Design a protein around this ligand. Structure first.
Ligand SMILES: Cc1cc2nc3c(=O)[nH]c(=O)nc-3n(C[C@H](O)[C@H](O)[C@H](O)COP(=O)(O)OP(=O)(O)OC[C@H]3O[C@@H](n4cnc5c(N)ncnc54)[C@H](O)[C@@H]3O)c2cc1C
Ligand SMILES: Cc1cc2nc3c(=O)[nH]c(=O)nc-3n(C[C@H](O)[C@H](O)[C@H](O)COP(=O)(O)OP(=O)(O)OC[C@H]3O[C@@H](n4cnc5c(N)ncnc54)[C@H](O)[C@@H]3O)c2cc1C
Lengths: 306, 306
C-alpha cells in the first residue's frame, strides 16, 4: 500500500480531509499530500459561524478538529508540493519535488487562492476587517460602513448582498464607468444604501491592530489622497485555482477549474476533484464537505468495479 | 414576514437546518415547519463518526448542536405536518392540518424513511446491532459476524462492502436464487468472507439490551427455526421518500424522489429540495449539509433577481 495507495488526496482543506475520512473509514490505503499546515484557506479565517454543529469556531481549531479524527483511521500524512500527476489507466503517479507516489485513485483537493490587491495593511487586517467573501463574513459587520473594491459583476452583486447587513456600502473603482451588466448597475443605483467613489484606488488600509477603522483612497486622475472611515473592506479581484499540476490532463476549463459531474469524477477515470478547485458556484466548508464525502465514498465503488 | 416568509423549510434534519442557517444568516425571514423532534433520522443513530469536525458524537447532541445556533439568527420554528404545498408563481402556500403559511420560497427537506422488516427486536436493537446503512455503521463492527437481509443489488453490494470490516458476512433471503445482477452474484460467490442462507426469513433479533448477540432464522420451506450468533445485522428493504405533500407538483420521479439540478432547484421556480428527499446516490449528513448550504444561499439569489 505504501508502494501503491488506494487513494492519494492532493490537498488538506475541508474537502481533502473529508474525502480522507470517508475513504479511510472504508478500510482503504489513504494518504494526503499537503504543502504546509492542514486546513488550507481556513487557517486565514478569524471566526466561522456557518458550519453546522458549531455556533462559532476559528479556522485553525476547526481544521485541527477535522484533522485529529484521521489518525484514528490510518490516514498517512505526507508533506509535498505536487508538480505533476500522470495517468496510466490502471494506476496514476503523483510527483513531488523530491519523491513520487503511485495510487489507484487521485482526489484533487487543492482548492483555490483569493487574488489580492497589493496594498499595505490588507494582509495585516485580513479577516479582521478585510475580507474576500461576503457570504463568509458579511453577517459580522451588521449596521456598519463597508467598502467594496472592484467594478465588475462580482463587486456590484457582493455589494448589494452586503446591503443586507451594513448601514452603507460604498464601492471604489479606478474608472468612471462600471463594466458590470446594466441590470445590476441599475439595481445598484436603485438601492439607497450603496454609493460609489469613481476614478479612485485603495491606497492603504488602517486600523487599531484589531479591526479595520479607515482606508486611505487615492484618486487616479488628481493623485490626491483622502481618508474615509470604514468598519469593513471586502475585495473581490478574481481567484486562482491551484491547477498547475494538472495542465497536462485536459480536465480544466479555460479559467483552469477542474470539470466534474455529480459524482466528483473527472473525464479521466480514477481521478476525482473536490472542493473549491472545482467548477462550482458556492464555495464553502459545507460544500467542500459534501463534495469530499462523495469522492471518498466513490473511491470504493470505482475500486470494486475492477 | 409572518404573513409571508422569505423562506419556509419543510423538515428539520441536517439539510433543512443548514438551509435555515445560511438563509437566515443572509437576513431573510426563515421558518422551519417540523413534525416533532429537530434532527430527523439522526435521533435514531447511536454514534456518528463520519461528520467532519467531530471525532464521535450521538444523533441527538449533534442535532441540538446544529439547532441552537439557529435561534441566534431568528429562525422561527413552527410545529406542523405539511399536507400540501401549492404554487402561485410569485408566491407559494404550505398547508398544515390546522394552519397555512405563505412564502416566496419553499425548501423541501423532508428526507426519507428506511423501510423496516416487521420483526420483534429490530426496533429494539436499531443502531445497536441493527442498521440500515453499511456506509454509516459498518466501520463499527470490525472483525465480527454480520447478517445481511435481502437478495437484490442492495443486499449483495452492501454485503461485500461489509466484508471490508467483518470477519464473515452471511446474507439471508427467502428464496433459493438471487434477483441481483449476475456480475455482483459472481463477485459475491467469489469473496471468501461471504456465505448465504437460502429459503429463510429472519424470525427475531435477540441480544443483551446493549448489542445484538443472535438472531432466530426461520426456513420458509421447512418451517423450523434455528438460532445463529451475529454481532450485527444490516437490513436494506428499500426506502420511502416523504413526498406525499408534493404529489400535485410533478417534481418527483416514478419512485417519488424530488428531481433537482446542481442548484437544488426544482422544475417549479422558487421551490427547492435538499437532502435525502432528493434523487441522489450518497445520503449522508455531509451531503445534506452541502445541499442545504446551496439552497439556503440560492434563496437570496432567486429573491434578488425579482
Ligand atoms: C478570508 C477568508 C474567509 C473565509 N471565510 C469563510 C467563512 O466564513 N465560511 C466558510 O465556510 N469558509 C470560509 N472560508 C473558506 C472558503 O470556504 C474556502 O473556499 C474553503 O476553505 C476551500 O476548501 P477546499 O478544501 O476546497 O480548498 P482549500 O482549503 O483552499 O485547499 C487548499 C489546500 O491545498 C494545498 N495545496 C495547493 N496546491 C498544492 C500543491 N501543489 N501541493 C500540495 N498541496 C497543495 C494547500 O496547502 C492547502 O492545504 C474563508 C476563506 C478565506 C481566505
Ligand atoms: C439507523 C440510522 C443510522 C444512520 N447512520 C448515519 C451515519 O453513520 N452517518 C450519517 O452521516 N448519517 C447517518 N444516518 C442519517 C442519514 O444520513 C440520513 O439519511 C440523514 O439524516 C437525512 O437527512 P435529511 O435532512 O436529508 O433528512 P431527514 O433528517 O430524514 O429529514 C426528516 C425530517 O423531515 C420531517 N418531516 C417529514 N415529513 C414531514 C411533513 N409532512 N411535515 C413536517 N415535517 C416532516 C421529519 O419530522 C424529520 O424531522 C443514519 C440514519 C439512520 C436511520
Amino acid at each position: 500500500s505504501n508502494a501503491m495507495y488506494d487513494t492519494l488526496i492532493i490537498g488538506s482543506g475541508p474537502a481533502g480531509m473529508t474525502a480522507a475520512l470517508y475513504a479511510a473509514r472504508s478500510n482503504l490505503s489513504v494518504a494526503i499530500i499537503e504543502q504546509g499546515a492542514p486546513g488550507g484557506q481556513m487557517n486565514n479565517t478569524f471566526d466561522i459561524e456557518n458550519y453546522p454543529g458549531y455556533d462559532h469556531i476559528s479556522g485553525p481549531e476547526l481544521a485541527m478538529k477535522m484533522y485529529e479524527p484521521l489518525e484514528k483511521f490510518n490516514v498517512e500524512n505526507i508533506y509535498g508540493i505536487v508538480q505533476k500527476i500522470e495517468n496510466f489507466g490502471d494506476y496514476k503517479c503523483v510527483l513531488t519535488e523530491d519523491a513520487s507516489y503511485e495510487a489507484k485513485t487521485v482526489i484533487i483537493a487543492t482548492g483555490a487562492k483569493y487574488r489580492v490587491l497589493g496594498v499595505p495593511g490588507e494582509e495585516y487586517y485580513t479577516s479582521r476587517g478585510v475580507s474576500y467573501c461576503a457570504v463568509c463574513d458579511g453577517a459580522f459587520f451588521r449596521d456598519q460602513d463597508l467598502l467594496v473594491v472592484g467594478g465588475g459583476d462580482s463587486a456590484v452583486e457582493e455589494a448589494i448582498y452586503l446591503t443586507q447587513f451594513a448601514k452603507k456600502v460604498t464601492v471604489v473603482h479606478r474608472r468612471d464607468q462600471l463594466r458590470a451588466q446594466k441590470i445590476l448597475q441599475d439595481r445598484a443605483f436603485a438601492n439607497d444604501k450603496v454609493d460609489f467613489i469613481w476614478d479612485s484606488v485603495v491606497k492603504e488600509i488602517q486600523g487599531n491592530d484589531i479591526k479595520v477603522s479607515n482606508v486611505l483612497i487615492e484618486n487616479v486622475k488628481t493623485g490626491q489622497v483622502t481618508d474615509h472611515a470604514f468598519g469593513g473592506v471586502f475585495i473581490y479581484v478574481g481567484m486562482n485555482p491551484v491547477t498547475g499540476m494538472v495542465k497536462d490532463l485536459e480536465i480544466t476549463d479555460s479559467e483552469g477549474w477542474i470539470i466534474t459531474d455529480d459524482h466528483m469524477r473527472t473525464s479521466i477515470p480514477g481521478i476525482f476533484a473536490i472542493g473549491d478547485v472545482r467548477q462550482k458556484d458556492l464555495r464553502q466548508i459545507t460544500t467542500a464537505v459534501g463534495d469530499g464525502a462523495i469522492a471518498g465514498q466513490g473511491v470504493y465503488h470505482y475500486l470494486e468495479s475492477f
